[PDB]
């Protein structure tokens, strides 16, 4: 019904994939989720939670017919989730995770129903607070929280609550203190993207790793350290959960080329930071810290991860590099997963990310490129995603 077009060289779809721009003019759209009524809720950062009414003509033929601001709150900056029954919306500021009653008869939120479920999350620099509600354990809410600086010493202290993911049984609800949740992982500089694999309920996160990396004082920031895919075990069990994934004393290797003191290190292995606390060595990184399951190209900046219904594929948004001479990212990629809920690629792979939508000319980014942020599936397996810098929502599907 509406003719919406991109204002930059359009994304390139891999063979077998098609897409359509369905919404424009949003302020800075981040997390997105469908409600029970087929409306798309958008966390529009600096505005609040917006609901988009869609007409669906099938395939990529969707049009926005109306938009409404459900929750007006300029402090909401990224995180959004909705209960499986559709009656509770969760959204986060830098400091607080709020729960609101959502009236799906009227598609309204009464602001007086707001309650704080998690608090004390405030810190500088990395200010997003991703929310994930478990499907396998529907009363479990995961909350991710990044570092206070590029290299944050408080991330060494687990009680600070910096650079870690926590889980809360919201059925047991004054709000939880952040560090009162179950520890899913710490030493996670800024793992904005957190998802659950339906094959087995495995918890996965994607990492925005350190900027300005040095190795024996040599600048190796152009191609290191890699971005990471981290595994946190099964929700409710302790196996492969609650460890320290290395920030800020250990980083993962992406590019071996010209890397000082490589030794026995391979792609995917973690090595000690030049600025690691006194006494930490490469060996400490091997024995005491948890390595990533897979690494990606340095600085692609992943922001969300969503699995399809079968659990055969995860989709990841690469929001794009900001400080690399030639830009990288600005894409949507897929990673293949096996029957045991783990990636089919080995941990030393440099080719695990398969291109779904890419920018045609990375030299133009980020000014003339989309910057994917949030993903969500609808009930029939179409993928929807936000581009915050461009104020856009897209639909994506196999043709
Ligand atoms: C949401 O709906 C409002 C109201 O229809 C839209 O605001 C209009 O935007 C158009 C340009 O697209 C203007 O020409 C109109 O004057 C605006 N109307 C009003 C009353 O403000 C808004 O653009 C829509 N936004 C989204 C994201 O759908
Ligand atoms: C790690 O972080 C925790 C955060 O709780 C620090 O504990 C606080 O320390 C400040 C300053 O010493 C005190 O004013 C608070 O009373 C402490 N809070 C608690 C819960 O006791 C701790 O000092 C930091 N250092 C560590 C523990 O290594
Ligand atoms: C280790 O910490 C030092 C902190 O000094 C970092 O070195 C800084 O790197 C930038 C280059 O991007 C220089 O402009 C600064 O001048 C350097 N030191 C300062 C601020 O005086 C180094 O990047 C860190 N190495 C990492 C993160 O691997
Ligand atoms: C186990 C199984 O049914 N595998 C399917 C796969 O063939 C299909 O390509 C995919 C599409 O998302 O969904 C899943
Ligand atoms: C948040 O931290 C303060 C200490 O700074 C603590 O007293 C409070 O209990 C924490 N949050 C809640 C609501 O427990
Ligand atoms: Ca790590």
Residue numbers in the entry: 28 to 200, 205 to 430
The publication says:
Here we report the biochemical characterization of the AA12 enzyme encoded by the genome of the ascomycete Trichoderma reesei (TrAA12). The three-dimensional structure of TrAA12 reveals important similarities with bacterial soluble glucose dehydrogenases (sGDH). Based on these results, the AA12 family of enzymes is likely to have a catalytic mechanism close to that of bacterial sGDH.
The three structures superimposed very well, and no major differences in the main chains were observed. All the structures solved present a constitutive calcium. The calcium ion presents a typical octahedral coordination.
